[PDB]
Paper text:
Here, an automated procedure is described to identify the positions of many cryocooled crystals mounted on the same sample holder, to rapidly predict and rank their relative diffraction strengths and to collect partial X-ray diffraction data sets from as many of the crystals as desired. Subsequent hierarchical cluster analysis then allows the best combination of partial data sets, optimizing the quality of the final data set obtained. To demonstrate the general applicability of the workflow described here, we have applied it to various systems and scenarios in which many crystals of the same type are mounted on the same cryocooled sample holder. In all of the cases presented our workflow has yielded data sets that are fit for purpose.
However, our experiments using monoclinic crystals of [name] show that the method can also be applied to low-symmetry systems. Prior to mounting, 1 µm 75% glycerol was added to the crystallization drop for cryoprotection. Diffraction data were collected on ESRF beamline ID23-1 using an X-ray beam of 10 µm in diameter with a flux of 3.5 × 1010 photons s−1. However, this is not the result of a combination of low-symmetry crystals lying in preferred orientations in the sample holder. Nevertheless, that the merged data set for monoclinic [name] obtained following HCA is somewhat incomplete suggests, for some low-symmetry systems at least, that data collection from samples in two loops with different orientations in the X-ray beam may be required to ensure a fully complete, high-quality data set.
Numbering used by the authors: 1 to 129
Write the structure that this text describes.
């Protein structure tokens, strides 16, 4: 699934990302835009042999099992395929663990590079939430 901006904002808000750990909803929508272009099936390989999965580009090195990163952790206790689902619940629940893991949203390099410090409230412009 490729979400619309406000469609994704609504789904994220329903699943509790709005202000989660003090990060307003626009942060999360912005992170998704630049991590995945709102595409639930986005995957990008990392140079170390892990892969980033789904709408929030979660890393299989630590967070999910894809069988392809032998000896890696599965801290969300889910297969990585689940993070490519058209429904975002698994990705959100895992993202909540990631954002609480000591670095806030700095975990997402695209958020750091393109959202951090900007007017992230712009990302929910015109949304009916």
């Amino acid at each position: 699934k490729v979400f619309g901006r406000c469609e994704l904002a609504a789904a994220m808000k329903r699943h509790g990302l709005d202000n989660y750990r003090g990060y307003s909803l626009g942060n999360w929508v912005c992170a998704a835009k630049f991590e995945s272009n709102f595409n639930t099936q986005a995957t990008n390989r990392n140079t170390d042999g892990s892969t980033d999965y789904g709408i929030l580009q979660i890393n299989s090195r630590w967070w999910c099992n894809d069988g392809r990163t032998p000896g890696s952790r599965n801290l969300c206790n889910i297969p990585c395929s689940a993070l490519l689902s058209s429904d975002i619940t698994a990705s959100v629940n895992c993202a909540k663990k990631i954002v609480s893991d000591g670095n806030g949203m700095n975990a997402w390099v695209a958020w750091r590079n393109r959202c951090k410090g900007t007017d992230v409230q712009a990302w929910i412009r015109g949304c009916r939430l």
